Amino acid sequence: GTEFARSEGASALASVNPLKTTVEEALSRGWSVKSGTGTEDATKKEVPLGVAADANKLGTIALKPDPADGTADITLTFTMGGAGPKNKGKIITLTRTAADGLWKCTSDQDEQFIPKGCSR
């Protein structure tokens, strides 16, 4: 009853939303994106997302496929394994469809805690 359920959802989305830019900039160069931290790899032409999987203690960030080259749908997920009771186990998913390059946000949280712009 005292859990910060609405702020948890906003913090989670704020950890993955900025990565859309990172992904688009890499694909515009014809480079692939790979998860984790590190330096660009000029041999394989892969750019890391630049954020650790556990950057936000509310949960974990994941990329699929990994690496991703733009020719298949890409998903960025924030799994709230560190959240309070109402949001623990819930997942915010950002999907970039390869056929049109568009992004969508879906969440399996209770409707009242889904961040603005995301749907069930």
Side-chain angles (χ1 to χ4, degrees), residues 1-5 7-43 45-63 65-85 87-103 105-110 112-120:
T2 55
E3 181 187 345
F4 301 132
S7 312
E8 284 176 330
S11 176
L13 182 58
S15 283
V16 286
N17 203 60
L19 300 172
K20 292 183 301 186
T21 298
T22 305
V23 168
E24 291 300 342
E25 290 287 283
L27 300 184
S28 289
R29 293 160 62 187
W31 284 46
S32 292
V33 55
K34 64 179 175 174
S35 69
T37 64
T39 54
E40 294 189 358
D41 180 349
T43 296
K45 296 197 173 47
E46 298 177 352
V47 178
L49 287 177
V51 62
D54 67 333
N56 185 328
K57 299 308 183 185
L58 285 171
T60 167
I61 295 164
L63 168 73
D66 184 10
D69 64 12
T71 69
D73 295 344
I74 290 170
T75 172
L76 284 168
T77 54
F78 192 96
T79 299
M80 300 178 85
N87 281 316
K88 183 161 171 195
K90 304 301 193 172
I91 301 172
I92 290 176
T93 297
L94 304 194
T95 301
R96 180 192 192 271
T97 30
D100 53 24
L102 293 187
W103 288 86
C105 176
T106 57
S107 172
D108 60 10
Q109 290 167 279
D110 274 317
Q112 73 188 272
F113 305 122
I114 292 177
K116 177 190 173 177
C118 303
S119 70
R120 202 164 163 67

